[PDB]
């Protein structure tokens, strides 16, 4: 039952562990070729510099990822980029360096259709996790069918990413590829959950005792006990806050403490397998694993409490015993179990820790139920009829009047315009409600990646955003509130746009902004890039469904003042039409605001304009 869930057998685990140990003898990495499998093992390090970067001035050695090199490691709709440990990222950067032949070896294995496996022990396993993401970004994501599913297997690895990191891994359906083995008491997976000020004095000694090749520094009881107590105190604070950061009826005190609490951002990413003498327990839910990292590291009675720090040290070197006795241990998948009492009882988890784990699992199943309900909703006839009516009845009738459905909605002279407004409001309510669920993290990580949702939301945005723009300008909202692009655009459309752009752009490693600015510079405007960015600030040319918004912002202004934005809109129009973002049957109509304004442009522009032959 273990292999059908993790997709790896005991053979691969054993080879990965052997390579991770062999990596101790190299400078950067060791490559082990085992027929169809190529294993890259990274050398671990036990200096405090390699856990908290000296030049990092944050309380947990964290740093935001560069959106250019890891475009997927972010929230799509919200935009917030993921955060990782800076020391681990610098170490990965040092191993990806062309001079190391690491990348050449990766591509040699890729061309050979070998099963690629990334692995490492202790902090080396953390590097392996980041290397896997690099692989996922560079190779697997561009065409995930012919490329072979990789595996990342870590042993006692520190935590690497934050909650956004885990969310992004979940959305891409990548978490299933990661297995992190953690012996019950192992202190190392808990290390980065503590504030760096809490262990600044005791960390070098503990790292010296944990290093298997450093039998020089004499073991000190005091330092290890102080270290364990500091780590457990900060871990307990993080876990209890995570408990509160799920429930409710206390958002005020949580916001005040958020302004005054420094809690570690690092969260479990991927499947975790906890091991005892008699059990192997696999867990997928990151929140549940976070809780288990605390409640599995306590004493059963409190008189053994003086003994626990030494077992928490010794357990970091007990993964060898784990690997040899895998098949002799009882395995269960915690998320799929009908009863979790036995597993958590064997892990020494207290009653309260079990109730927190159960609550985290209940919350994830609630999110799954919400997604099933959303699919049932968006497939019902009463919902789809509104979009069908807008597309097949309102638009053709407005085209027949030779003014278009934007101008017809804007003047709203007929009953059909108020009926369209009613259905626009109902659709707005439904998509705002979905956005609300997303904002509260009450949908599955995969939600923003579901292609059925992206299809529907794109059809909705293309059909109805022109109508919300018309409604906006009908009520004179642009000077009072401000620019639509600046202060008026509903967030639901921004989420829809970003979800679609990510869906279509992520196989090519590029981000929407880069594609946009490359086309803008491709339009041969001649102006300085900084000047154009100044002109195109809050421009409507970043999304085809904001075409009419840009017209509103461009009409009335002198030609010299917004010439660049005009030429930008023209350069985007044909591709937008080809892509279906803008309907060609609408914008050229006799009574269209766009056509009426386009004729009033100077004749020198209209003469050499791409639209001369269309109006």
């Amino acid at each position, epitope marked *: 039952a273990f292999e059908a869930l993790t997709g790896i057998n005991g053979d691969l685990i054993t080879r990965s*562990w052997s390579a991770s140990k062999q990596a101790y003898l190299t400078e950067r990495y060791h490559k082990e070729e085992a027929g169809a499998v190529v294993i890259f093992a990274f050398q671990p390090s036990f200096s405090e510099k390699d856990f908290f970067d000296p030049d990092n001035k944050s309380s947990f050695g964290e740093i935001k990822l560069n959106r250019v090199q890891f475009p997927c490691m972010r929230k799509i709709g919200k935009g917030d980029v993921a955060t990782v440990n800076e020391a681990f990222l610098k170490n990965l950067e040092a191993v990806i360096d062309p001079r190391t032949s690491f990348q050449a070896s990766v591509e040699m294995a890729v061309r050979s259709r070998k099963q690629i496996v990334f692995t490492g022990h202790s902090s080396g396993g953390a590097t392996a996790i980041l290397a896997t993401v690099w692989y996922l970004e560079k190779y697997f994501i561009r065409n995930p069918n012919v490329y072979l599913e990789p595996r990342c297997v870590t042993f006692g690895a520190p935590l690497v990413g934050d909650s956004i990191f885990s969310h992004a891994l979940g959305r891409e359906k990548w978490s299933r590829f990661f297995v992190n083995f953690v012996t019950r008491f192992d202190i190392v997976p808990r290390i980065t959950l503590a504030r760096k000020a809490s262990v600044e004095e005791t960390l070098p000694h503990v790292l010296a005792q944990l290093d*298997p*090749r450093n039998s020089s520094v004499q073991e000190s009881e005091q330092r290890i006990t102080e270290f364990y107590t500091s780590v457990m105190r900060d871990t307990s604070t993080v876990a209890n806050q995570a408990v509160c950061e799920l429930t409710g009826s206390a958002e005020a005190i949580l916001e005040t403490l958020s302004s005054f609490l420094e809690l570690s951002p690092y969260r479990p990413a991927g499947t975790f397998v906890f091991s005892t003498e008699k059990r192997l327990v696999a867990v997928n839910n990151s929140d549940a694993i976070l809780q288990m990292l605390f409640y599995t590291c306590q004493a059963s009675d409190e008189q053994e409490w003086s003994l626990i720090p030494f077992r928490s040290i010794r357990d970091h*070197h007990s993964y060898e015993e784990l690997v040899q006795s895998m098949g002799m241990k009882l395995f269960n998948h915690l998320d799929g179990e009908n009863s979790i009492e036995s597993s958590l009882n064997d892990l020494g988890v207290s009653t309260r820790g079990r109730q927190y784990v159960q609550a985290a699992l209940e919350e994830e199943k609630k999110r799954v139920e919400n997604q099933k309900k959303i699919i049932q909703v968006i497939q019902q006839e009463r919902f789809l009829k509104k979009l069908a009516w807008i597309e097949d009845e309102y638009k053709p009738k407005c085209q027949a009047h030779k003014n278009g459905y934007y101008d017809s909605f804007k003047v709203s002279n007929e009953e059909n315009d108020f009926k369209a407004n009613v259905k626009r409001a109902e659709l707005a309510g439904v998509f705002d409600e979905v956005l609300g669920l997303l904002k509260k993290c009450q949908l599955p990580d995969e939600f923003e990646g579901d292609i059925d949702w992206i299809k529907l939301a794109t059809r909705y945005r293309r059909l109805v955003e022109p109508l919300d723009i018309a409604n906006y300008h009908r009520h004179l909202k642009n000077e009072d509130t401000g620019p639509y692009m600046k202060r008026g655009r509903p967030t639901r459309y921004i989420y829809a746009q970003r979800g679609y752009e990510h869906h279509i752009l992520k196989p090519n490693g590029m981000i929407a902004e880069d594609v946009f600015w490359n086309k803008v510079n491709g339009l041969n405007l001649g102006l300085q890039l900084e000047e154009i960015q100044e002109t195109l600030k809050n421009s409507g040319s970043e999304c085809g469904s904001c075409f009419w918004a840009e017209v509103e912002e461009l009409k009335g202004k002198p030609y010299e003042e917004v010439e660049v934005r005009v030429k930008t809109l023209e350069g985007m129009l044909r591709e937008w039409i080809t892509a279906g973002e803008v309907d060609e049957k609408e914008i050229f109509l006799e009574g269209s605001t766009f056509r009426k304004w386009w004729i009033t442009l100077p004749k020198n522009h209209k003469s050499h304009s791409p639209l001369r032959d269309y109006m």
Partner: nanobody
């Protein structure tokens, strides 16, 4: 830089006892098990007996089982193998491998007279 150290070999008659030591100085002391193998010119380098430097549990191959014994000491990072009631077939060069072998040292001779 990193190497192994062996000591203990010699020559005993039948039904004797011999203790072999294995200094594990260098790199990675406890994350490995350690296991004695023996190679006799004319016989393959079969397995003798291994044990973990975290788990006292001793695995002993059947060819030498019941007569050999292992012991562990992480302080001096050393695995000891004591054997008794030896028989003429125990003549070989013994290597204390890293169970997932780390490297291959020099080993020690062990000879038993009839």
């Amino acid at each position: 830089q990193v190497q192994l150290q062996e000591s203990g070999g010699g020559l005993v008659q039948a039904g004797g006892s011999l203790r072999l030591s294995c200094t594990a100085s260098g790199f990675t002391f406890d994350s490995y098990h350690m296991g004695w193998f023996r190679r006799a010119p004319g016989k393959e380098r079969e397995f003798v007996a291994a044990v973990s430097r975290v788990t006292w549990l001793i695995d002993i191959a059947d060819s030498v089982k019941g007569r050999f014994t292992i012991s562990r000491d992480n302080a001096k990072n050393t695995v000891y193998l004591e054997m008794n009631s030896l028989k003429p077939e125990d003549t070989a060069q013994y290597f204390c491998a890293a169970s997932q072998y780390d490297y291959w040292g020099q080993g020690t001779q062990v000879t038993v007279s009839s």
